[PDB]
Amino acid sequence: PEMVRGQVFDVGPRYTNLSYIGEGAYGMVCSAYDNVNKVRVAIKKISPFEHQTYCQRTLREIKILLRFRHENIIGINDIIRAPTIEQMKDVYIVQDLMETDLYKLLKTQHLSNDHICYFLYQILRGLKYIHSANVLHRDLKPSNLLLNTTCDLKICDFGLARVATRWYRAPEIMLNTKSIDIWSVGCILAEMLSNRPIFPGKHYLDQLNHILGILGSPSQEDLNCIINLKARNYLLSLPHKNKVPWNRLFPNADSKALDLLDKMLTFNPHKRIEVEQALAHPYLEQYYDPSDEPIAEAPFKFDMELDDLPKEKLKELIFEETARFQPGY
Numbered sequence: 001p002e003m004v005r006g007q008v009f010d011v012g013p014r015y016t017n018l019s020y021i022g023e024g025a026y027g028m029v030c031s032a033y034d035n036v037n038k039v040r041v042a043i044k045k046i047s048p049f050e051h052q053t054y055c056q057r058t059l060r061e062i063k064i065l066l067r068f069r070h071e072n073i074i075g076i077n078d079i080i081r082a083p084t085i086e087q088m089k090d091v092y093i094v095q096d097l098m099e100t101d102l103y104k105l106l107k108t109q110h111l112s113n114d115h116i117c118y119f120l121y122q123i124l125r126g127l128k129y130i131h132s133a134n135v136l137h138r139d140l141k142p143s144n145l146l147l148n149t150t151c152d153l154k155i156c157d158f159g160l161a162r163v164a165t166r167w168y169r170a171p172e173i174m175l176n177t178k179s180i181d182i183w184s185v186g187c188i189l190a191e192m193l194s195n196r197p198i199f200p201g202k203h204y205l206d207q208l209n210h211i212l213g214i215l216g217s218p219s220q221e222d223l224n225c226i227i228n229l230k231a232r233n234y235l236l237s238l239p240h241k242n243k244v245p246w247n248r249l250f251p252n253a254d255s256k257a258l259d260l261l262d263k264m265l266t267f268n269p270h271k272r273i274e275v276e277q278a279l280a281h282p283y284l285e286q287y288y289d290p291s292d293e294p295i296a297e298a299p300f301k302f303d304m305e306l307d308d309l310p311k312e313k314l315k316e317l318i319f320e321e322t323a324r325f326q327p328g329y
């Protein structure tokens with residue numbers, strides 16, 4: 001078995017010629033050659049069994065990604081884990097290999113207005129499907145937006161996905177709602193326009209300050225909803241902040257792109273634009289095609305209350321969910 005950065009990757013004999021992609025808290029992504037399909041694939045190693053929260057994420061992503069089928073959403077082609085539950089410490093999720101991600105692309109490339117428009121369309125087409133299944137992604141960021149050589153976009157990382165970095169987090173998450181994904185897509189749109197994050201806060205306080213520095217001081221109506229007391233008081237203790245017009249921050253940006261940006265980056269989630277209205281925005285006219293925008297057959301529903309389940313039980317559910325990919329099923 002191969003070793004990638006002192007981490008073992010037990011995916012052989014089928015998957016070999018491993019190469020590092022990235023890593024998180026309890027997982028590592030590599031690329032490898034599939035000796036059956038004769039292509040390179042992406043493999044995601046997960047070690048979640050010590051924590052209940054990590055077990056919940058793993059099971060949700062596996063369940064959601066195996067039911068969904070849409071061009072702009074990553075699937076699961078294969079899953080590797082030990083023959084027995086006692087020996088299963090890791091789960092390897094095999095997925096389509098893409099050329100890069102938006103995080104990497106925005107670090108080296110300046111995007112044309114037509115490419116910002118096209119990438120934005122595919123995010124919203126993907127999210128149109130997700131939201132139609134009554135699911136929120138809850139963690140849309142440039143690293144979760146995969147791109148291939150022909151500019152096809154796929155949304156990955158459904159660990160935080162639920163049935164309806166802090167830089168892409170909606171203010172209502174920071175002040176205690178498919179609207180949270182729209183906020184993230186708004187942040188991503190702004191980063192595509194300038195190659196830098198619009199709200200790069202070092203901490204939540206710095207995050208809220210970055211937000212108010214552009215949007216201006218929140219209105220009474222915006223501070224009317226259920227809000228955390230510490231957060232509400234903090235905002236009430238701040239000196240007035242003026243709203244910075246969108247053309248001052250993005251002088252070169254397409255005004256239609258700035259109209260949609262404004263509607264997505266709305267403090268009040270109840271006043272924020274929805275996915276379908278965003279797809280119909282004049283800015284996405286050249287790509288908008290409701291004939292070619294699939295929705296889910298029925299809303300996604302989990303059979304069990306996963307949050308209440310002990311980590312040992314979640315492991316069993318994971319073992320059963322992953323059984324269909326084992327030889328002799």
Ligand SMILES: O=c1cc(N2CCc3n[nH]c(-c4ccncc4)c3C2)ccn1Cc1ccccc1
Binds near residue numbers: 027042096098144157
């Ligand atoms: O869940 C996923 C799946 C991911 N990928 C799998 C599919 C794919 N195809 N092409 C690529 C790619 C190709 C070239 N450059 C970058 C990416 C991926 C990346 C990536 C991130 N995360 C979040 C994560 C990672 C580790 C632990 C926990 C969470």
Ligand code: NI
Binds near residue numbers: 115150151
């Ligand atoms: Ni292209």
